[PDB]
Structures are given as C-alpha cells and as structure tokens.
Amino acid sequence: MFMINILMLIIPILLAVAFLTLVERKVLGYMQLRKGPNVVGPYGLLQPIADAIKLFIKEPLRPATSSASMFILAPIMALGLALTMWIPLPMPYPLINMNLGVLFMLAMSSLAVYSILWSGWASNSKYALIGALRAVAQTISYEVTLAIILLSVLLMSGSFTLSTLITTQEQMWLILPAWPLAMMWFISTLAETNRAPFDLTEGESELVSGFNVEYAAGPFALFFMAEYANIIMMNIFTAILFLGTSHNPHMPELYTINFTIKSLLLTMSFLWIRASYPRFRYDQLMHLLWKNFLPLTLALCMWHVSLPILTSGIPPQT
Amino acid sequence: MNLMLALLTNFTLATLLVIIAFWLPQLNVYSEKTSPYECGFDPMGSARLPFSMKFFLVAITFLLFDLEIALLLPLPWASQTANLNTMLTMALFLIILLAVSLAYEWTQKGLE
Amino acid sequence: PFFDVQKRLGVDLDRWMTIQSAEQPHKIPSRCHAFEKEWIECAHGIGSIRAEKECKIEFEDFRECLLRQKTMKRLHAIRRQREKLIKEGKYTPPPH
Amino acid sequence: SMVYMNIMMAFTVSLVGLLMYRSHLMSSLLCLEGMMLSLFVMAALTILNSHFTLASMMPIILLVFAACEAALGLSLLVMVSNTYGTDYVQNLNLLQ
Amino acid sequence: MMLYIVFILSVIFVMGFVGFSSKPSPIYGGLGLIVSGGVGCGIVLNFGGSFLGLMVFLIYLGGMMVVFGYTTAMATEQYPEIWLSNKAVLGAFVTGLLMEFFMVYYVLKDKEVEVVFEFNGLGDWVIYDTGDSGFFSEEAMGIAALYSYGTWLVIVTGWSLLIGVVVIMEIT
Amino acid sequence: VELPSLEDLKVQEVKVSSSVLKAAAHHYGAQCDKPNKEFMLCRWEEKDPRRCLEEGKLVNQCALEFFRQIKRHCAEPFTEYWTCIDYSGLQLFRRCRKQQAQFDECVLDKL
Amino acid sequence: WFEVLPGIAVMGVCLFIPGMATARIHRFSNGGKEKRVAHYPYQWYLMERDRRVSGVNRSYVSKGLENID
Amino acid sequence: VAAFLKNVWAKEPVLVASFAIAGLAVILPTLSPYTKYSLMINRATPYNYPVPLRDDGNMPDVPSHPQDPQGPSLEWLKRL
Amino acid sequence: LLQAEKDRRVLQMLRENLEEEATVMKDVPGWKVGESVFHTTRWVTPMMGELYGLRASEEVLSATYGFIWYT
Amino acid sequence: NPIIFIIILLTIMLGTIIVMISSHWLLVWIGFEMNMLAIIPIMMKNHNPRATEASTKYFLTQSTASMLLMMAVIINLMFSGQWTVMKLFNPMASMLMTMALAMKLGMAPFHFWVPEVTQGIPLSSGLILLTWQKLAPMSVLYQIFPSINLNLILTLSVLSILIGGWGGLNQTQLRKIMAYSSIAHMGWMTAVLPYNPTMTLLNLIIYIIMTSTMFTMFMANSTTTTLSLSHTWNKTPIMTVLILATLLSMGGLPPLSGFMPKWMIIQEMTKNNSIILPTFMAITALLNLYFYMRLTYSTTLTMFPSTNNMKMKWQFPLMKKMTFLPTMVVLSTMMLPLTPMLSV
Numbered sequence A: 001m002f003m004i005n006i007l008m009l010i011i012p013i014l015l016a017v018a019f020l021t022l023v024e025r026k027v028l029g030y031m032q033l034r035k036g037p038n039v040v041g042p043y044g045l046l047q048p049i050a051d052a053i054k055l056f057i058k059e060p061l062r063p064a065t066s067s068a069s070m071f072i073l074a075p076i077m078a079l080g081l082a083l084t085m086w087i088p089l090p091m092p093y094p095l096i097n098m099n100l101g102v103l104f105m106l107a108m109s110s111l112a113v114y115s116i117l118w119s120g121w122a123s124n125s126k127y128a129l130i131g132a133l134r135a136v137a138q139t140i141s142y143e144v145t146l147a148i149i150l151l152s153v154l155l156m157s158g159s160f161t162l163s164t165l166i167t168t169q170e171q172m173w174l175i176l177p178a179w180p181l182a183m184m185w186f187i188s189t190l191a192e193t194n195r196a197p198f199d200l201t202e203g204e205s206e207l208v209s210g211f212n213v214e215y216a217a218g219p220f221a222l223f224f225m226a227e228y229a230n231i232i233m234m235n236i237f238t239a240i241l242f243l244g245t246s247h248n249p250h251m252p253e254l255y256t257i258n259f260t261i262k263s264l265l266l267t268m269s270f271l272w273i274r275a276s277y278p279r280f281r282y283d284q285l286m287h288l289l290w291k292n293f294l295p296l297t298l299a300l301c302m303w304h305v306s307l308p309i310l311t312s313g314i315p316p317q318t
Numbered sequence B: 001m002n003l004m005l006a007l008l009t010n011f012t013l014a015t016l017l018v019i020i021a022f023w024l025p026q027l028n029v030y031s032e033k034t035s036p037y038e039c040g041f042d043p044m045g046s047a048r049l050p051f052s053m054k055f056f057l058v059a060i061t062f063l064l065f066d067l068e069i070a071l072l073l074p075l076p077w078a079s080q081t082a083n084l085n086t087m088l089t090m091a092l093f094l095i096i097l098l099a100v101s102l103a104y105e106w107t108q109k110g111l112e
Numbered sequence C: 001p002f003f004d005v006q007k008r009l010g011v012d013l014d015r016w017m018t019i020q021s022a023e024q025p026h027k028i029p030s031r032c033h034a035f036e037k038e039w040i041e042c043a044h045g046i047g048s049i050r051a052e053k054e055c056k057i058e059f060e061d062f063r064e065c066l067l068r069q070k071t072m073k074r075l076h077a078i079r080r081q082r083e084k085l086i087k088e089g090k091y092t093p094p095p096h
Numbered sequence D: 001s002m003v004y005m006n007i008m009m010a011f012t013v014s015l016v017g018l019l020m021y022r023s024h025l026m027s028s029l030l031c032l033e034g035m036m037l038s039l040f041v042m043a044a045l046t047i048l049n050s051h052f053t054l055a056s057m058m059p060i061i062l063l064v065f066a067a068c069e070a071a072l073g074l075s076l077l078v079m080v081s082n083t084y085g086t087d088y089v090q091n092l093n094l095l096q
Numbered sequence E: 001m002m003l004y005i006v007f008i009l010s011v012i013f014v015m016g017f018v019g020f021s022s023k024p025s026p027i028y029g030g031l032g033l034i035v036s037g038g039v040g041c042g043i044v045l046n047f048g049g050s051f052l053g054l055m056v057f058l059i060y061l062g063g064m065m066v067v068f069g070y071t072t073a074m075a076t077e078q079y080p081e082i083w084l085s086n087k088a089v090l091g092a093f094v095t096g097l098l099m100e101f102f103m104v105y106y107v108l109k110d111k112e113v114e115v116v117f118e119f120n121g122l123g124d125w126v127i128y129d130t131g132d133s134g135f136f137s138e139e140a141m142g143i144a145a146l147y148s149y150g151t152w153l154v155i156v157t158g159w160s161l162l163i164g165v166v167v168i169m170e171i172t
Numbered sequence F: 001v002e003l004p005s006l007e008d009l010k011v012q013e014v015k016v017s018s019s020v021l022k023a024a025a026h027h028y029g030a031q032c033d034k035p036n037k038e039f040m041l042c043r044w045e046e047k048d049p050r051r052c053l054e055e056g057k058l059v060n061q062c063a064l065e066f067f068r069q070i071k072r073h074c075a076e077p078f079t080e081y082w083t084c085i086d087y088s089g090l091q092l093f094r095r096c097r098k099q100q101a102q103f104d105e106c107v108l109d110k111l
Numbered sequence G: 001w002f003e004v005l006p007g008i009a010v011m012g013v014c015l016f017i018p019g020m021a022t023a024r025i026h027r028f029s030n031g032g033k034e035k036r037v038a039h040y041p042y043q044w045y046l047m048e049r050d051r052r053v054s055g056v057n058r059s060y061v062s063k064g065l066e067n068i069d
Numbered sequence H: 001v002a003a004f005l006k007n008v009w010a011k012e013p014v015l016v017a018s019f020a021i022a023g024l025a026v027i028l029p030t031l032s033p034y035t036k037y038s039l040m041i042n043r044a045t046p047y048n049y050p051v052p053l054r055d056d057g058n059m060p061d062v063p064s065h066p067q068d069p070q071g072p073s074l075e076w077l078k079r080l
Numbered sequence I: 001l002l003q004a005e006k007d008r009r010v011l012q013m014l015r016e017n018l019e020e021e022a023t024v025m026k027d028v029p030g031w032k033v034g035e036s037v038f039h040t041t042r043w044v045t046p047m048m049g050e051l052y053g054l055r056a057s058e059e060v061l062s063a064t065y066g067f068i069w070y071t
Numbered sequence J: 001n002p003i004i005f006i007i008i009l010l011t012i013m014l015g016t017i018i019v020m021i022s023s024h025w026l027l028v029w030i031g032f033e034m035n036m037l038a039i040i041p042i043m044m045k046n047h048n049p050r051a052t053e054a055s056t057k058y059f060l061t062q063s064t065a066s067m068l069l070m071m072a073v074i075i076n077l078m079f080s081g082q083w084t085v086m087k088l089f090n091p092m093a094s095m096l097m098t099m100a101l102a103m104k105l106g107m108a109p110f111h112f113w114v115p116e117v118t119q120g121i122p123l124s125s126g127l128i129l130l131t132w133q134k135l136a137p138m139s140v141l142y143q144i145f146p147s148i149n150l151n152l153i154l155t156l157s158v159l160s161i162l163i164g165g166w167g168g169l170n171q172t173q174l175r176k177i178m179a180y181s182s183i184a185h186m187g188w189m190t191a192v193l194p195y196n197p198t199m200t201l202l203n204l205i206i207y208i209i210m211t212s213t214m215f216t217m218f219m220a221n222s223t224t225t226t227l228s229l230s231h232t233w234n235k236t237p238i239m240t241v242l243i244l245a246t247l248l249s250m251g252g253l254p255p256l257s258g259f260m261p262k263w264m265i266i267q268e269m270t271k272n273n274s275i276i277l278p279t280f281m282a283i284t285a286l287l288n289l290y291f292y293m294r295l296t297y298s299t300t301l302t303m304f305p306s307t308n309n310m311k312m313k314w315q316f317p318l319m320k321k322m323t324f325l326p327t328m329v330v331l332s333t334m335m336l337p338l339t340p341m342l343s344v
C-alpha cells in the first residue's frame, strides 16, 4: 500500500497551502485593527472552498504572441519540485530514507529557479521579460550565502543524513552554539523564496506584478499554490535543522504533535513581518550580500572547522 | 524500487492539472476575440533585448565562487582521518583562496 | 623532456594515485588487485623492450581479469547449450 | 558490457560541423560544454565498477575545470556579440 | 522495473544528445541538456556511486547551465520563428536516430550478428557487482574526501581557480 | 579447477534472526577465541578459502554449543533482552541499557 | 483576537495527518516494529540474510532462541 | 595606530567581525592541549578487522585471550 | 562466524551451477568440465554471472540491485 | 595592472613546468589545460576587433585539441588501468593522441590556424610566447616515444614541411612569413622522432634561438615588408647587416649554424638505411629558402627611402639579449660536436 502512503501526503497538504491563504489575512488583519474574512464562513473557515472554484471557471486566456510549448512545461514544474522536495523529510519517519539526502534539497532548491526563467521568457516583453530576468539574478546569489551556512553546522553533527540530525539536537536545541549563523539561515529563505522585505520578484511597488502578470485564473492558481508550497517547507525544514524535537520510540505521535506546534509558529513569521517592513531597491538588495552577509559566512567556516578539532570533539560519523 | 513510484506519481498529478485548468474552458464557447489587444500595458514594444552588462557579470561572478564550494564540500567526511594536520593546514587554504578572490574584484563591483 | 625532479629531492607530487595497488586509505582492495603485484613483479629489472616478448603471460590474463572479456563469452555460450533445447528435454534445473 | 557502447556513441557529440557551425555560435559552444558527461560518465564507471577507491576524486576534477574553463570562453562570446548583437559564425574578418 | 532499467536510460541519454547535437535554436538547446544531464546523473546513481552523482545536479546542471541560460538573453536571438523555424533542422535528425536503431536492431536481433557487436552479452548485468563486502561510508566513493594523500592535486586546482577571476576581471 | 563434492555441506548453521544475533554477540567472542582467531589465519595467511574448510566447522561449532549452552541456564532474561533491542531501527544499544543488567545478572555471576 | 484561533486549526491538523500516516503504515506493514534502515552495505547484508532464514520470505519475522533449540 | 582601529570601527564594523574570527581560529589550534587528544581518539576506531599475527618465540605481548594483559591503555577515554 | 557462512554458500553455489551444467549436454564440440578461463591457478572471487546463470528472473534483481534503492 | 602582468606571465611556464615534471596522466591534462586558460588575456591588451576575433578562433581550436586528449587518456584507463606515462597499450589511444595532439603544434593539416592567429594579433610585442607552446607538447612526445603507428608521424611530417613551405611564397605581411616556415621546422623535428629522439631537441633549441632573435629584431617599429625597405636609409645600417646575417642562416648554409641541424640529422636518418626519405625533405627545404631571398632583396637594395622621414632621435627599446644571440645563432657551427652528447 506504499502508493496509498504517498497519495495521503500530496492530498492532505494541499489543504494547508489552501487554508494558509485564509490565515494570511486574519493574522495580518489584526495587525491593521480589523477582522478577517468573516461574512461567508460563518467564521471564514469556509472561504477557501469558494475561492478555489472561482478561478477554474474563469476563462484562461493565452497571449496571441506567446510560444505555447514553453507556456506549459514551465508551470508543470512549479508544482513538481514543490511537491517532490517534501519526500525525504523526517516527521519522524520520512517516506524515503536517503543516505546523504540533506544535499538532495539543494539539488531541488537549485532547480526551481530554472522554472522562473522559462515562464517570464516564455511569454513576452519587458514587464515579464527583463522583469523575469533580474529576479533570476538575485535568486542565485542567495545560494552562496546558503550552502555554506548549511555546511557549517554539518561539521557540528557529523554526516549528511537526517536521522542523525535528530540525535545530535537531543538536549541542546542546536540554536545555542551557532546563533550567529541561525540569523542568516533565516534572512536567506526569506530572501530566496521572494517574500516580504525583499519582495521584488513578485511585483507590487517596483513594477506592476512580477512573473504572475500574464496567467489568468487558469494557470495562476498553480503558482499561487506553488509559491506557497515552498514557503511552508523551508520553514518545516528549518525546525528539523535547528529547533529539534525529542524523538520517542514509543509514542511517535507525540513527536509530530509537538513538532507542528513549532514549525507552525515559526512560519507565522513571514506573515508577522510583511505587515512591518518596506523594500530594498534592487541595488541595495545584492549590494548588501557580497559586501556584508558573505565575509562572515566564510569567516565562521574557518571557525566551526577548528572548534571540533581543537577540543577533541570530532563528531562520530563518516 | 519505490522511488520512481514516488516521482511519476507527483508529476502525473501536476501534468494532469494543467489540462483540467488550461485546456478545459479553453475550448468553451465564449467569445475570445483575436484582436491584438493582448500583451498588457506596454502596447507594442518593438526592440531587441540589448546587452546590459552589470546584468551579465552577476552570472559569471557567481559561477566561480560556486565551484570550490563543491571542492569545499567534503570536509565533514574528512574530519575522520589519520594525520589531521594536513587537513587543518590544507582545509583553511581553500577558504582563504576563496576570500582572496573576493578582495581583488571588490575594487570594482560596479552597481551589482 | 622528462626531468623527474621528484626523484632527486624528496617531495611526492603524484606517484600515489598512479597504479591500481598502492594504499587505498583504509586498506581495501580492488577486484583485480592481486594480479598487479604479480605483473609488476615480472617486469622491473627488465628494460621493457624485451618485456613485451618476455612476460606477456602474467599480462594477458590480467587484461582478462579486468574486462572479463572471455569468461563472458564461454558464459554466453551456455545459453546455446541450454535454451535452444528447452523443449527437447532436461528443463534443468529442478526447482528449487 | 553494453553501457560502454552507450555512452560512447554519445561522445561522438563532437560532430564538428556542429562543433563550430553553423551560426548561432551558442549552439557550437553548447555541444562543447556538453562534450563533458561523455568524458565524465564514461570515466565515472570504469573508476567505479572496479574499486579503485583512489582515483575516485578524478571525476570531481574533470568538472572543476570543465566548468571553470568553458565558462571563460563564454566571456569572449560577449565581446563578439557586444560589438555586433548577432554572433553568427559568419564573421571572418581576419583572413588567411 | 526489470533488469533492463539501465539499458533503457542510456538509450534515452544517447537520444538525449542528438536533439542539440544538430541545430536547435538554442533556447531548446538547454532542454536537450537538462534531460541528458538528468538521465546522465540517473545512470550514475546505480553502481553504488551516489555522492558523486548527486553533485552534477548541484555544481553543473543546477548551477552551471543557468549561466548558459542567463545569457542567450544577452546574445538574444531574433524572434524570426525559432525551433521548427527554417526548413533544414529536420533533415539531419533521423539518419542519426535510425543509425543506432538500425544498429540496435540487428546488433543483437538474433543469436549473434556478428563478431564485433557479438562479444557484448546482455541481461543479467553480468559484471555489475561482485560478491559481498563490508562498509566504509559506503565502500567506494563514500571515501572521496582526501585532504590527506591528495595535496599537490588540490593546490594546483586550488591555485588555478584563483587566477580564473583575474583574467575575467579584465577582458570585461 | 577442483571443487569439493556436495558433502561436508548441509551442516548445522546457526539459524537466528539478525536482532538476536547481535543480542549477546559480545560476551560471545571475547571469551571463546579457541578456533576463530586461528581460523582467520587459515584465510589471511593462506588465501583461497577452498583449501581451508576445516576450522570452518570448528568455528561454526563453537557457536552451536554457545547458544545451546545459554538455553539451559537462563533464556528468560535473554528472551526479554533481545526483544527491546529488536524494537527497532538501527538496533541501538543505548535504549536497552537498563535491561542490560537483568540479562547479565547471573550470567557473569552464575555460569 | 479569538476569531483567528479557528483559522489555525485547519492548517494545523492537515499537517498532523502526514506525520501520523507514514508512522502508522510502517508500524502496520511490518506488524508492530519500526522499519529497518540500510545505510551501509554491511547493515543490508544481515537483512538479505535474515530474509532467507526467517520463515518464508520477509525480513520482519525473527525466529528467536528456540528456533535452533 | 589604535586610533585607526577605533576609526574603522565607527564606519565598517562588519568585516572586522570576520577578521576578528578569521584569526583566532588559525592561532588557537597550536595552543590548547586538548588537541592531540583529538588525534589519538581518531586513530583508535577500528574501521577494519584486526588480524592476529603469527607468534613464534616473541610475541612481545598480547596473548590469545584479549582481556588478559596485552597492549596499550585506551581506557583513559572511558573515564574521560 | 558470519564469513564462514558465506564461503560455503558460494562453493555450494558453483557446484550446482556446474554439476547442473555438465549434465545439460556433453557435446563433442563442447567444453571440458570446469576448465579455467585463465592460465594461472588460484581462487579468484567469481563474477555475478558465475553464481547466477542465465536464470535471471527476480531473486537476482534483488541481489545485484538489492542494496541500492532500498531497505 | 603592471604587477599582475608578471603574475600571469609567470603562471604560463608554471603551466608548462607541471607538464615536464609529472608522472601522471591527469597532471599532463591540468598541465596544459591551464595555458588555454592563462594565455588568453595577453592577446587582448589593446582591446581591438581582431585579437578578439583572433583568440576566439584560437580558443575553440585549442579547446577540442585538449578535450580529445582526455578521451585518449581514459581509453587505456580501461585497458591495463595503469596511468603514469608510457606507451599507450592500445592503438586507439595513440592514434587518438598524436593526430589530435598535432593540433597544438600544428602540423601538416590542422593549420588553417597558425596564420589566422599570428596574423593580426594586434600585439606583435610577443607572440614570442608562441615558442612556449612548441615546448609543452614535445615534452610528451619524448616520453610516449616508443608507441606510434610510425606510418603517421611521418605522414603529418612530410605533408607539413611541404605545405608550410609553399604557404608563404605568396605572402607579404611578415608576421605571416614567420607564421609560415614555423610549420616547416615542425617538419624536421617530428620526422626524426622515432629514430634516436635526441638530435630532435638539438633542432628544438637551435630553433628557439633563431626564431627568437628574429622577433627581437623585428621590434623597433617593423611590420610590413615594404616598411623594411625604409629601414637602412633611416633607422641604422648596422641593423641591415644583421637581418642579412640571420634570415640567410635560418634556411641555412654550411658556414653558418643554421646548417647544424640538417648536417647532424641526416647522420641519423641514414645509417638506418632510409635514404629515399631525407632527400625529399632535404630538397624541399630548398624552396623554403626563396622566402628569405626576396625578403633579403628588400633591405640591401636601397629601395626608395620612405619619404622625407627624419628620425633624429636615438632609441629606447629593450634589445635585451639581442646583443648576444647572433653570435650564437651564427658562429656556433665551428664549435660543437657537443649537442648530440651534451643534452642526452
């Protein structure tokens, strides 16, 4: 029945990414002093069944000027590498056990931006043309900030797999010891996935609407359901790579219970920001990475290398 | 043998869902006029995409810092050895060979 | 012209990765490992110009350890001793 | 066995009319930067199916230049089509 | 999911190439690679070498190609028609595709034909393993990390890259 | 080539799972060492594990009476000991640490 | 302030399924014992052995001490 | 020169935190005696299988029974 | 102990893949019973094609590819 | 800028020192893989629309030239699986070595290149550095030396010293005339190579000097043949007796040293009782001389001094070590039966 363990995953998650869109504007509602979608629910909890159905009724135009062969294979992705990445992710028991799999995320973190470059180019001119070009450029310069500061800690835990990374955070919430890094693990995923303070990719201010501009109701649910299938995953990751829970070979169930009451707090962070801060004006946006974020990330790497060796600490792995 | 069962499962929901959205009302009987009114709010736009350089280097500039952090990758497996000094003395070279390669270019980024 | 400095003074530039049997850090072998220490033992004090017409035996099987070139043919030729006669008797084996 | 004749027919990707030509140089330079993987994979098996255990890094060093260098020679292809806007191998000017 | 799941990848790989080994309007050139690179990193993930496979995604297919694709907006081709554009690409294709096919047809369509294509048997993966073994990180490229014995191999590559930028800080 | 017949085969293999086989496994070898180290030297010292089959039946033998020993005195603490370690994944040794004494109560003591 | 307390309870539970599904399929498919894991070729080597000796074909049925008497 | 070192720390206090950690990780591995413990532990982990040597005459040490007095003390770690 | 179980499993395995070969056919243009593809004489660990014949059904597929792609 | 130009210009020879010093096929890849990486910026310096349509016709012609080699390294990693550096153990290796390595040297074919680069590199300064790349490859061929199909390395030779000869008789630009007849002297040294491979180097050093001392002379302003006419009545006549004391010696006549390689080489190529080969080489370098005559009828015949051209100033170039070489490029014949027993 291994095929019914899968399809029990893909389906029950599409409800979260659906019902996030509701808690989008309730939480961001009371920052403003008001209430959130209310009239339709009664509580509102019934809103997203009505919204999923307005789009696919609503007619899906294509530009007369487009290349239809690319205008499909691209979105036929924004929903794969979002739903594949979930596969080897322990909670506690991952569906797959990949030996070195931690590295496998970067494989699928790196291969999504090659679905932006298609779509914005697939269609047409300068609002999605050079406007989907220069959100490529920022999306690849926030990896080098990443793979390093992912690679740092992994000196402090011994291997590339995720079954060890529950063992080492036992009674030490891995955020003490590298708290300088942890910050930069946060501003990255918020800068890379195109969210609030570095917002530019999806346009509001700097342009009209980035990269979404052409898709009518028909395809544009996918992206608007793809872009929220990354955001609740990196944030359902960070908390396996920092704030660890305590496995329990007996009541596995109490592992996940206490696990979603963390990863679900953590997420409610990209909403708790977006009410707050303004945007960066694309110069300042990269111009603050090389100069500023990076020099440290190298420097710390020269540090977490020696700290095990200089304490006879060297973590028990191959 | 069950990985590919967990991949082609995933696409086939996605490669399905394009047609049941894009295609299904696409053959609907509504008007859908062929008028060249599309390509919103930059009506005509006749040009080649000109070369704009400081767009370009931020490609190259990365690609090279990229390589060696593949070279740099097998530290945590190499922390288990016999003679370890040839590591710390050597490991710390790559980094400084990376960080140097900054400082030079750092005289000119331009507007990045 | 091949100077061979690493002979004169002390350093090792490469000389380690060179052949199929040297170290292998945890001491783990190759498959055809045992035929190296056999074949190098042959031509060393030789000047290699008579090697080709001298040793050649300890070399050939070594080339036939490596690729399994023949044993795969005498094998593929059991598929012609059986599996043309399947209907003509001796199913071979009895399962199990 | 068979996987050594594929990939090999793949490493005749050279095919040279399509190595320098015809225009859109970027197609030529492309089949070059993918002439690797015929060098890589082919050398990621022979190293692997027999346990060398040592040359195993070599596959890594076959990229680290193949990306480093082939990414250089991209640069010129800006200088050509900076002053033009079309690469078009059909620029001959320096003659003989 | 038979024993032939390797032979079915490569002959897709070998067909991965001939797409861009002719003349496809090189915004589809990429789509001749990331399939070929993908299936390529596919084949390698058998045989037991893994780490060394999963890198090609990270360092090349993921990282490199995007630069190859981040340009061809700077060299940007004209919007003449692209792909099926000019009536010429199609002529060169098939004769390649059949040339392995007609090869693959009677290479072995029978007992043997004849000699040079007859010394390759098929179907059990005769060589593809040996015996059993112990474990070190796996056995094979599990230990690919030598900052021990390898040094004069790194320090050239370590130094040869550092000059990569200086050359390119100029002509730029 | 010469291969021995089909005979001196079909011998008594210790048939147990891989969880119990690592249960004791520890008191096991440290105290025996009568054939086994010696049996290595009939392999490493001279290869071709064909010419040397003999101690193979000695080293296989030592196990037989070992598990046949333990069944007589105390199988009750053992049976319960290799249950926990058989409660599974990775077969850690740091979960059953408590019960490690109950198995080893009189084994190091009685016999 | 309260009206958002229901909004969570949809998303929250919908992530408490996929963690209890896989956990209780493995425990159910192998009958009470968590799934084995083979990282290193030695570790595998005992399962593919244990399949042979178990009762028929599977790795999850252990014989025990009385098996060999 | 200390007026300099305080007049770059009123302007760019960023990379200074990298240099401050750039060294101070290079220097220390040659100091604290905890190290070189690190090289002893890491040598003694038996990845491989020990093969017993042949004993004719000496046999310096290391009898047949392992727990008998044989060889060095690795149990300075167990107490550690 | 663990190994002294295997070496017997292959020598048992060759014999049946020989004794049940030599009784398939004895052909006049055939092969001698159990010759050597080499000249040299000692025990060299056999290739997968030696242990399992053209049998090639399933339990092979769970042997060579058994470890890779999954528990 | 000025520091690095000595960092780059140093790394070249470090690119070719790992070539001559190594045991290990990988390094002779990396070794002359980082020339095609470290040569390229030198071409540039004045950033013109030739060098950049030059070094790009150079680049991809030394890109594959390398990248085939790596295919003929990894063949005999299959067979014999022993790297190092020795005969190649398999014929598809060597035939894919030597006739894909002739690309860097370029031999009889594989030169539509040497005139397309050497011409119209805006930088004539040097362009003396294209005497390194003759010296990297040979330091393989001396090692692999006892494996060649032997019907080839002559067949690229004898189709070379011919084809590089006729190439120039039709030429005027004198960067080309050196470009041509530098395929020629690649005809003598790899025609010998299977017979007694020293008495090759002999021709290799005598070559590095003579072509060297040309350029250093061609550096004052000199470019086109008819700018070497305005030479003797303008710059200095002691220059003209020089350019006539070499260009003649370089095709060679016995009282000079240019006759030194042939005179020795044929001691070798007969005594192996091949006497029908060397005449045709010996006789073909003849019409390799008729460039130089008719080059040398430019400067001693006082041909129409340029125009009113008054250079009253003295010189400040770097003649460095030119005040030596044409006492060693000429007068050394009387000296040496050393060269066969000295480098050996």
Ligand SMILES: CCCCCCCCCCCCCCCCCC(=O)OC[C@H](COP(=O)(O)OCCN)OC(=O)CCCCCCCCCCCCCCCCC
Binding pocket: A073, A076, A097, A098, A099, A100, A101, A104, B003, B004, B007, B008, B011, B015, E034, E035, E038, E039, E041, E042, E045, E046, E050, E051, E054, G038, G039, I067, I068, I069, I070, I071
């Ligand atoms: C648009 C519609 C048309 C497209 C439809 C099809 C799209 C397919 C796209 C493929 C994208 C995902 C491919 C990524 C491959 C990743 C494989 C991987 O990393 O698996 C990890 C694992 C490592 O093995 P390890 O854990 O170390 O050892 C276990 C020991 N028991 O590895 C293993 O366990 C063994 C590997 C088993 C899997 C076999 C190989 C699978 C990969 C083949 C991909 C083919 C490429 C397809 C195109 C890719 C384009 C992006």
